[PDB]
Design a protein around this ligand. Sequence first.
Ligand SMILES: CCOC(=O)c1cc(Br)c([N+](=O)[O-])o1
Ligand SMILES: [Mn+2]
Ligand SMILES: [Mn+2]
Ligand SMILES: [Zn+2]
Ligand SMILES: [Zn+2]
Length: 145
Amino acid sequence: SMYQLEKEPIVGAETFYVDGAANRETKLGKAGYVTNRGRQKVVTLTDTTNQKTELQAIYLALQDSGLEVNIVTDSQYALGIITQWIHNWKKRGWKTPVKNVDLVNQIIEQLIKKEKVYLAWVPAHKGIGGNEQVDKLVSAGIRKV
Ligand SMILES: CCOC(=O)c1cc(Br)c([N+](=O)[O-])o1
Ligand SMILES: [Mn+2]
Ligand SMILES: [Mn+2]
Ligand SMILES: [Zn+2]
Ligand SMILES: [Zn+2]
């Protein structure tokens, strides 16, 4: 393709647990990450949606990370649209998506600069791991948990 994502986590590389949450009534949201080297960031956003905040969190993880990065997301949309764009680049049956295309195309630019990326989906779940902590962080003031 235009790139290849890793098929299993990159051993040794820092992992970013990304998440975003938005509120449909106000279009307010937050995107951010926590990492397994004790890094964290949360941004507040306006005029956004849940899909945009999930994508924005991924963008931030690519922005702030080294050449090799492990990314854990709970958004099937974000993983799919990114993986589809890579797999179907400059190829026959491609028609780029309508929604979020500006955000997705900036993500793709961040991506090909990387050496190696592992991007995986896990369902939102409860507990104390990374997805749980970043969920609470992006959900604060946006959504009851
Ligand atoms: C605010 C609720 O917790 C989350 O951040 C969250 C839940 C779901 Br469900 C998704 N998603 O991308 O499928 O992200
Ligand atoms: Mn999420
Ligand atoms: Mn979540
Ligand atoms: Zn390397
Ligand atoms: Zn977890």
